[PDB]
Structure formats: structure tokens, C-alpha cells
């Protein structure tokens, strides 16, 4: 369901709590499109030291891969563009070790691009905790981001450390990351027999289950001001009373307005939390999950 009529007023701001840095692009409004769905107001953003650290490093990572990509097509963009999907940047991969001193093309190139990848993401995590505590909210999104960081850390840093080879990490490239993934199945005896990958599919599926339900239930109970959620948490009315009964009378139970968000975060976090353990064992302890399996 989208907006019927759209209503604007003056640029909204709220707190930000720390140093007013939160001003970059105090304007934006995108009535045209965004307001039909979500909020028309774009901006402001809080760019602070960490913000800058991440964007600098994120662009540096991206551009490192960028210039390394260009080399593979020489210089010709007509070419570069068709082969954009097939280009890659493999670790060392050149297979041998975590031996650091390795050429730009055979090691160096990936290590320096991965040095930035590391810092963009890690500073950002830091940022999400700061902006949390500033407004007096604290950790929750940053709690959940660390599992995404877990799976990311597993596949690029931690597992290659354990298998003494940076060659174990996912290579930068669009189709390469699809093929490393396929081969990973293969050399470990089909990842369907890995009980954690089956559990991660249970949670990935589970998350599109839960949001398709959570979402649809507020959009059915918006009628009673349902979407306001926190007020219903601090004062229940018909919206949280009625949503409860829908699910109780359907499947036998239901969940408190604050509590279904405790269901929601947990179902999403256990997609990368589970998965990360899953790949941490694959290859370092279990090389064939089928066999492991057949011992059951």
C-alpha cells in the first residue's frame, strides 16, 4: 500500500547528541518517489572522524580493485565494461601461504585491498555503537552487526589464518565470489550435509518468514495506529491487542509488540552467527561433511 496524499513540512531534525557534524546535506526531499513509500526527507548525515575513516578506506578498497581491474583490460573501457563481471583479484592464490611478502599480482594486491576492506567495515561498526550511545540508545544494532562481521571475518581473515594460507579467502570479483562459493561445496563434500549450513538456510528462510509476517501484521493493524510500536510498547492498545489474537487464534500463540522484535533480531543474527561457525569448521576440522554425516 503506498501514500494516498503526501504531506511535507519544514526539514525535520531530531537530536544527534554529539558535535554538530550532522548537517551535511540538511536538504534532499524526494517527494517524486521516496515519499510514496517511506519518508521523503533525505539528509542530514553525521560525517565524523570514523565516518570519514570508513568512506576513505571504502573508496580506497574499491578503487584499489578498480585500478587492478583496469590492468586486466589494459586501458580500454569498451572492453573493461564487458569483462567487468569476469575480472578478479585472487589472494596470493597463487596458493602458497600467509607469507606476507608477495608481489602486486601474487599477494600484495589483495593484501593491500583487503587492508582497506578490513578498516572500512570495522570503523563503521565503531560508528554504529557511537551513534547508538550518543542518542542514549546503546548497542543493539551494533550487537547485531557483529554477527555479520563474524561471517565476514571467518571467510577472509580467520579461516585463512587457521589454514596457513591467504589463498583460502574469497577473491574480489563478481563471478569469482560465485565460483569460490561453488568450489567450497565441492571440496568439502557438499555443504548440504554440513548441519550448520542447513541451519543457516533454516534461519535465512526463517527471516523472510518472520519479516513477511511482522510487516504484513503492522500493515493490517496500521488502522489502529499499529506502526507506532514504541507507544504500544509503553501503552498497549487495539493494534497490539488485535495482532496478538490473530496469531494466537491461527497457530496457537503470539508475541508481545516489543518481544516480536526480540524474535526478529534473533532470527536475522542467527543467519550469519550460525553460518560463521559453519564455515569455521569446514575444512579446518571436517574436510568432507558427507563422511562426518555417515557417522550418523
Amino acid at each position: 500500500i503506498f501514500s494516498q496524499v503526501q504531506v511535507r513540512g519544514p526539514a525535520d531534525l531530531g537530536m544527534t547528541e554529539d558535535v554538530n557534524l550532522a548537517n551535511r546535506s540538511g536538504v534532499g526531499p524526494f517527494s517524486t518517489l521516496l515519499g510514496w513509500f517511506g519518508n521523503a526527507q533525505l539528509g542530514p548525515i553525521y560525517l565524523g572522524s570514523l565516518g570519514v575513516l570508513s568512506l576513505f578506506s571504502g573508496l580506497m578498497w574499491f578503487f584499489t580493485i578498480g585500478i587492478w581491474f583496469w590492468y586486466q583490460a589494459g586501458w580500454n573501457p569498451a572492453v573493461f565494461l564487458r569483462d567487468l563481471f569476469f575480472f578478479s583479484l585472487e589472494p596470493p592464490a597463487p596458493e602458497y601461504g600467509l607469507s606476507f611478502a608477495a608481489p602486486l599480482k601474487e599477494g600484495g594486491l589483495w593484501l593491500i585491498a583487503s587492508f582497506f576492506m578490513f578498516v572500512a567495515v570495522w570503523s563503521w561498526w565503531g560508528r554504529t555503537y557511537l551513534r547508538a550511545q550518543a542518542l542514549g540508545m546503546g548497542k543493539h544494532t551494533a550487537w547485531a552487526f557483529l554477527s555479520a562481521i563474524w561471517l565476514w571475518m571467518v571467510l577472509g581473515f580467520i579461516r585463512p589464518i587457521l589454514m596457513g594460507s591467504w589463498s583460502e579467502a574469497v577473491p574480489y570479483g563478481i563471478f569469482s565470489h560465485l565460483d569460490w562459493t561453488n568450489n567450497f561445496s565441492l571440496v568439502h563434500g557438499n555443504l548440504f550435509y554440513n548441519p550448520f549450513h542447513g541451519l543457516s538456510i533454516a534461519f535465512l528462510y526463517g527471516s523472510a518468514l518472520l519479516f513477511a509476517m511482522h510487516g504484513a501484521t503492522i500493515l493490517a493493524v496500521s488502522r489502529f495506529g499499529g506502526e507506532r510500536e514504541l507507544e504500544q510498547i509503553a501503552d498497549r492498545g487495539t493494534a497490539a491487542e488485535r495482532a496478538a489474537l490473530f496469531w494466537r487464534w491461527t497457530m496457537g500463540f503470539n508475541a508481545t509488540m516489543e518481544g516480536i522484535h526480540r524474535w526478529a533480531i534473533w532470527m536475522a543474527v542467527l543467519v550469519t552467527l550460525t553460518g560463521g561457525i559453519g564455515i569455521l569448521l569446514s575444512g579446518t576440522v571436517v574436510d568432507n561433511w558427507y563422511v562426518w554425516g555417515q557417522n550418523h
Partner: protein, 237 residues
């Protein structure tokens, strides 16, 4: 390792499904359901620990294992034999606010935005607020669940911080005004209508105490009553 890890994972999942989670779902629910036996089938942890929300703006506290009950009364007689059956409406249920027209006695106070005071204010009062896309509902004749035009949109009551049309103030032919919830009206290029409430009994919408300020209780009464037009307005099959 591995089998040890998944075994212990299953342990933790058990320890995260009931405990902590179904536990936290009990917090503000029926904290144990009576009108029968108070649990009757298996046991939860008999409600979780108390927890208390500190409210801002005014102030307040809410000790969330909520030991409340209703005697605000439920005009709902019984069909008797199955201990667990329909509860008969004894009196015009839309008026009675029972079933699909139930309200809840949330505080009789307006919800204050982040700074303070009044999230929903009418657009008359809205600090430089007016329509950015789509047809303006104002002055459009509100119709019925029939041909019959029930009144005129005289204003939009706007949720200021989220910037959104919450309600439509409708000066009913009477000179009296009341609030149709946006999510219950289809704004059209020439009519505009809550083809969800008769026309016949628009009048019965719970009236506003202060014509510029909606209160949670008031709000909840209007939304609830409006909803009951679906089903109870005997057109609406």
C-alpha cells in the same frame, strides 16, 4: 569438535526459544489466562521477571509484567455450553465497542513527539505544512457505503515528526467534526470515502474533547469504532 558444537548449539537454541524469548512474550499479555483455568495446558516459566520502563516527557513508569484486567465493561453475554464459545453482543456492539470495534483504555493523553507535545496536530495548526503530492482531500465530499454523501473534509490531522496524513477531519452535516483514519478512506478525484462506515452511523464516531489535540484513548476509540463498520454495517458483506 563439530558434533559437540551442533549439540551445544541445540542446547542454546532451546535455552533461547522458551527461556528468554517465549518468556519475554508473556510480559504484557494475559499474564496467565483465566475465564477458565489460568494456564490450563502446559506451563511457561510463570511469567518472566518484572521489568519497568521509565517514561519520558511527562514521566512515568510501567512495570511491564502487567497485572492489569478489564472492568471497563465488556457488554458480552454468553452462548454457554462449550467453555470457550462466542460471546454474544448485548447491545449495539459498535456503540458498545466490542468485537471488531473494541477500543482499549490507553492513557487519555496525547502522544508527545521527541521534544514534547502533540505528534498529531491538525494541518490548520501545522507549522508550515501542506500537501506535496497527490490530490488534496480538503473540501472533497465524503460519501457512504451507499451513494450517500456524509460530509466534507475540512482538514487533515498530520503526524508532524514522521510527516504524515494520519486522519481526516470531517465536518459532518451537523457542523460537528470527527476524525476518519486515513488508512480507512479512499481519496478519489471527486468523491473521497470510508466505504467501511455506513453514512447512517458516522455520527457515532467518539467525539473529541479538545478539537485540536487527539488523545491516545480518543484515538483508539475512533479507529476501533470505524473498523466495526466492516461486518457490522450490514451492507458490508
Amino acid at each position: 569438535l563439530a558434533s559437540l558444537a551442533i549439540y551445544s548449539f541445540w542446547i542454546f537454541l532451546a535455552g533461547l526459544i522458551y527461556y528468554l524469548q517465549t518468556e519475554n512474550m508473556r510480559e504484557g499479555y494475559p499474564l496467565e489466562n483465566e475465564d477458565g483455568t489460568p494456564a490450563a495446558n502446559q506451563g511457561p516459566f510463570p511469567l518472566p521477571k518484572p521489568k519497568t520502563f521509565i517514561l519520558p516527557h511527562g514521566r512515568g513508569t510501567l512495570t511491564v509484567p502487567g497485572p492489569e484486567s478489564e472492568d471497563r465493561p465488556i457488554a458480552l453475554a454468553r452462548t454457554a455450553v462449550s467453555e470457550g464459545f462466542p460471546h454474544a453482543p448485548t447491545g449495539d456492539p459498535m456503540k458498545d465497542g466490542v468485537g471488531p470495534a473494541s477500543w482499549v483504555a490507553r492513557r487519555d493523553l496525547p502522544e508527545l513527539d521527541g521534544h514534547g507535545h502533540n505528534k498529531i496536530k491538525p494541518m490548520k495548526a501545522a507549522a508550515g505544512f501542506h500537501v506535496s503530492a497527490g490530490k488534496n482531500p480538503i473540501g472533497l465530499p465524503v460519501r457512504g457505503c451507499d451513494l450517500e454523501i456524509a460530509g466534507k473534509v475540512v482538514d487533515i490531522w498530520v503526524d508532524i515528526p514522521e510527516q504524515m496524513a494520519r486522519f481526516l477531519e470531517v465536518e459532518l452535516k451537523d457542523g460537528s467534526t470527527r476524525l476518519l483514519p486515513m488508512q480507512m478512506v479512499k481519496v478519489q478525484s471527486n468523491r473521497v470515502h470510508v466505504n467501511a462506515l455506513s453514512s447512517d452511523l458516522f455520527a457515532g464516531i467518539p467525539t473529541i474533547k479538545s478539537p485540536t489535540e487527539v488523545t491516545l484513548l480518543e484515538e483508539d476509540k475512533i479507529c476501533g469504532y470505524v473498523a466495526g463498520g466492516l461486518m457490522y454495517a450490514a451492507p458490508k458483506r
